[PDB]
Design a protein around this nucleic acid. Structure first.
Ligand SMILES: O=P(O)(O)O[C@H]1[C@@H](OP(=O)(O)O)[C@@H](OP(=O)(O)O)[C@@H](OP(=O)(O)O)[C@@H](OP(=O)(O)O)[C@H]1OP(=O)(O)O
Ligand SMILES: [Mg+2]
Ligand SMILES: [Mg+2]
Ligand SMILES: [Mg+2]
Ligand SMILES: [Mg+2]
Ligand SMILES: [Mg+2]
Ligand SMILES: [Mg+2]
Ligand SMILES: [Zn+2]
Ligand SMILES: [Zn+2]
Ligand SMILES: [Zn+2]
Lengths: 81, 295, 100, 267
RNA sequence: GUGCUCGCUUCGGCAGCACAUAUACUAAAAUUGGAACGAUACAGAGAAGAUUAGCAUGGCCCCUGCGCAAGGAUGACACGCUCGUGAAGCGUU
RNA sequence: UCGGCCUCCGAACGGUAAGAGCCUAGCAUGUAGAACUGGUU
């Protein structure tokens, strides 16, 4: 219920019609301090990119092994039946 | 009808040491879906910052999926481990990976690799890093060690080129003469630099690396006895024996301080060739650097 | 897809509060302790209980046919249900009504 | 929740505040609206159309059928164009007062005439017909005001300008029509920039799409009932032949023809 | 820059203290690649005679439309799958 | 010396095909990048 309410609130806030952080960077090649600041979104401003780019559907999950009972081969009388 | 490329929204950009600058305290700006990727054309989280005092306000160009795919910087488009173009690293390791060029196939391949990465641990440059275990062939010879800050230099003032920059010293752009437009080094397609196809910087560094015989040796007429200079009395026969013990069995290991030469010979031709290639201006033992040649 | 900015007119917020069942509206805490079996038998028993000179002739004597409307009695024949849409009683009444 | 819009605008860095004479503000609003309707027209590459100044849309030359099909505009653009035309009329009346061409009594009479004859000076009603109700109310108000005005020695002249009631009516209309036009122009801008989704949201089954859709659903049901009726083996499913047999059986039912395939399996 | 000094001490200034501490998609540009679909030309309107109403169905095909509406030539586009020859495996001789 | 009751009201699609590509408009970007020569049988 908590996870689904988070998902519902995220979906509604995405569909709703309309602080600076400090992080430590280790470059692994000493450490740095980075002030994460989000730029202000202009409310007077249209969407930027075309999103109607249709591509064909991707590959699915790898297929499950198929359990079956051993196959009953139909007779020829069954074949004209 | 319900397949499209997902928008890559993530923090913590993957940058080089050189483009990040030198100050430990960096003030950083983030747009959620600011610009598009310069390769895969998807929208992505755009990071912008000033690397230093008189720099250019460098910003990220390609998306995080492409940069995690090719293990490169998001701005410099150079390799994170070595600071080299990806054409040079592909010539060093493997050039059979490739990528599609048509936009629908590129978007489909990028969506498949993005789904593969998101189904993976999250930060791994696929199995290509598994092909990148073998290293230090020749790429470490021409790799930079110092941070080359001159590519964070600001752009050339086009008004000053026509001699009309009225700002003068207030103008943050460079008031100096540009490079030669007739030079073929000045073309530099971004997609060519990403795909590793006919990049002139990569061709110039490959021609520079091909003219340095750091692994050639073989200057003797089927004789395994090679002389390593620069050793002297600082490096003795014990360091030469410890270097030749990795190759197997050594026929003769000696050091002479009169000519400052270490004579190394092996019973096997391949072991002697490996010992000559390892000691050709790349071996340092007991504080003494050795250069392998005929003796 | 939640990246678009196109809002449908029927995607506006409406009926934002969920109505729940009250105490007399069969809330599950009073459903869980009830026995539906016995109550179903007195409801079925209540339904079964509530289920139950010159002389002349007569003036109409000089006709040809008599008592022709003798076995004419519908009664329960209108209560028959047939699952054939051309032989149903409703379709027969429809065809005799709407076609002259 | 309150959610003040203008405080949210003033909290950002893209908005500033000042003090201004109202006539300059109305001229700025009219100039901004005309400039951006031209920007929308040039964004859609309709260079053969032309906006007036008084917001009259006209073609420059004769149109081909592709230009006629592409240059058609919906109710949102035309409704915003008519609303900007009405504000252009009011602001221009105040401008001609401020230049001294007309008198203040003439300005009040012009405002009364505008708010009583929105339906005669604008083509407002054609794109949203419910405003006829508002138009009717304005007409009724005019009658009320006139038959309290022309009472004593005053006659049937045009000198009565008492514009408060019609001004009230059109501002209450503007209160109601603000979120609908905001949603419509937001959808128009999102289709202009994001592009049109081709399939996207599934189409509903309307009246003109009932019968064929039912047949489609019927076909799908029969297909499912083929695929689990056929036993193990049998590569030739021949489901198209079974669907042809179903179509022929229905066509024989419609014509009261006895339908009997001589050899056909019983299920 | 402003204000003040158990100042140096001239009456100008120095020195100290206090306040004030990080703008910019940094361009007035050079570049770079994509194009309305109008002119000409190619071009040529579904359903086995003709003139034709249409609703769908599929998706790397879109346009007009605020559209879970309706249009765009029905918006366009979207047909050919019962015997022998060999091979392998199985059982009999 | 005896009554008042007064709806409406207009616009779009629906007809003046569709495709095509050659030079052409308009519009997007204000970009990432320039690494170069040395050792003894
Ligand atoms: O429609 P307009 O040309 O503007 O005329 C209206 C009004 O018309 P509506 O009743 O249809 O709304 C009356 O004019 P008529 O219908 O009687 O012809 C009215 O006239 P009265 O009150 O005298 O009956 C009055 O005209 P006026 O100024 O002479 O009083 C008024 O005209 P304006 O709105 O132009 O003032
Ligand atoms: Mg025909
Ligand atoms: Mg129709
Ligand atoms: Mg249609
Ligand atoms: Mg039609
Ligand atoms: Mg037709
Ligand atoms: Mg169709
Ligand atoms: Zn970098
Ligand atoms: Zn990318
Ligand atoms: Zn300059």
């Amino acid at each position: 219920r908590v996870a689904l309410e988070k998902s519902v609130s995220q979906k509604v806030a995405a569909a709703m019609p309309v602080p600076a952080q400090y992080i430590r960077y280790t470059p692994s090649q000493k450490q740095r301090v980075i002030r994460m600041v989000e730029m202000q979104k202009d409310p007077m401003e249209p969407p930027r990119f075309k999103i109607n780019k249709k591509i064909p559907r991707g590959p699915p999950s790898p297929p499950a092994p198929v359990m079956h009972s051993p196959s009953r081969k139909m007779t020829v009388k069954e074949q004209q039946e | 009808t319900y397949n499209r490329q997902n928008w890559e929204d993530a923090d913590f950009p993957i940058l080089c040491q050189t483009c990040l600058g030198e100050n430990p305290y960096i003030r950083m700006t983030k747009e959620k879906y600011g610009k598009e990727c310069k390769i895969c054309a998807r929208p992505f989280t755009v990071f912008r910052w000033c690397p230093g005092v008189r720099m250019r306000f460098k910003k990220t160009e390609v998306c995080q999926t492409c940069s995690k795919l090719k293990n490169v910087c998001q701005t410099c488009l150079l390799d994170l481990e070595y600071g080299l173009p990806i054409q040079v690293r592909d010539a060093g390791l493997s050039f059979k990976d490739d990528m599609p060029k048509s936009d629908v196939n590129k978007e489909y391949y990028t969506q498949n690799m993005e789904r593969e990465i998101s189904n993976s641990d999250g930060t791994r440059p696929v199995g290509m890093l598994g092909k990148a275990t073998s290293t230090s062939d020749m790429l470490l010879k021409l790799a930079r060690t110092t941070p080359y800050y001159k590519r964070n230099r600001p752009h050339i003032c086009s008004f000053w080129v026509k001699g009309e920059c009225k700002r003068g010293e207030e103008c943050p752009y460079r008031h100096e003469k540009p490079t030669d437009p007739d030079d073929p080094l000045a073309d530099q397609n971004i997609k060519d630099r990403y795909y590793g196809i006919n990049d002139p910087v990569a061709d110039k560094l490959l021609k520079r690396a091909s003219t340095m015989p750091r692994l050639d040796p073989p200057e003797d007429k089927t004789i395994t006895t090679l002389y390593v200079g620069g050793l002297g009395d600082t490096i003795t026969e014990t360091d030469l024996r410890n270097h030749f013990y990795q190759f197997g069995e050594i026929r003769t290991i000696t050091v002479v301080q009169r000519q400052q030469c270490a004579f190394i010979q092996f019973a096997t031709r391949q072991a002697a060739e490996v010992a000559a290639e390892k000691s050709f201006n790349k071996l340092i033992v007991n504080g003494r650097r050795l250069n392998v040649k005929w003796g | 897809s939640q990246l678009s900015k196109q809002y449908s007119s029927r995607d506006l917020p409406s009926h934002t509060k969920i109505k729940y069942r009250q105490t007399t509206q069969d809330a599950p805490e009073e459903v869980r302790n009830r026995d539906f079996r016995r109550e179903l038998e007195e409801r079925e028993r209540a339904a079964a209980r509530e289920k139950n000179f010159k002389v002349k002739r007569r003036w109409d004597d000089d006709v040809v046919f008599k008592n022709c409307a003798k076995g004419v009695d519908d009664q329960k024949k209108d209560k028959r249900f047939v699952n054939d849409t051309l032989r149903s009683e409703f379709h027969k009444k429809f065809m005799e009504k709407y076609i002259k | 929740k309150k959610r003040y819009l203008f405080r949210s605008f003033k909290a950002t860095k893209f908005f500033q505040s000042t003090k201004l004479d109202w006539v300059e503000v109305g001229l700025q609003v009219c100039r901004q609206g005309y400039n951006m309707l031209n920007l929308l027209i040039h964004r859609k590459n309709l260079n053969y159309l032309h906006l007036d100044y008084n917001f009259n849309l006209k073609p420059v030359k004769t149109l081909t059928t592709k230009e006629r099909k592409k240059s058609r505009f919906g109710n949102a653009f035309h409704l915003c164009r008519e609303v900007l035309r009405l504000t252009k009329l009011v602001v221009d009346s105040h401008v001609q007062y401020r230049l001294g061409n007309v008198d203040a009594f003439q300005l009040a009479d012009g405002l009364q005439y505008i708010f009583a004859h929105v339906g005669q000076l604008t083509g407002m009603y054609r794109y949203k017909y419910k405003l006829m109700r508002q138009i009717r109310m304005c007409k009724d108000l005019k009658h009320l005001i006139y038959y309290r005005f022309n009472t004593g020695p005053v006659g049937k002249g045009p000198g009565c300008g008492f514009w408060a009631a019609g001004w009230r009516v059109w501002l209450f209309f503007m209160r109601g029509i603000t979120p609908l036009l905001e949603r419509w122009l937001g959808n128009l801008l999102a289709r202009q920039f994001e592009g049109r989704h081709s399939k996207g949201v599934a189409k509903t089954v309307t009246k003109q799409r009932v019968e064929s859709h039912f047949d489609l659903e019927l076909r799908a049901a029969v297909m499912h009932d083929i695929l689990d009726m056929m036993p193990e083996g049998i590569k030739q499913n021949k489901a198209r032949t079974i669907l042809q047999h179903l179509s022929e059986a229905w066509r024989c039912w419609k014509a009261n023809i006895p339908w009997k395939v001589p050899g056909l399996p019983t299920p």
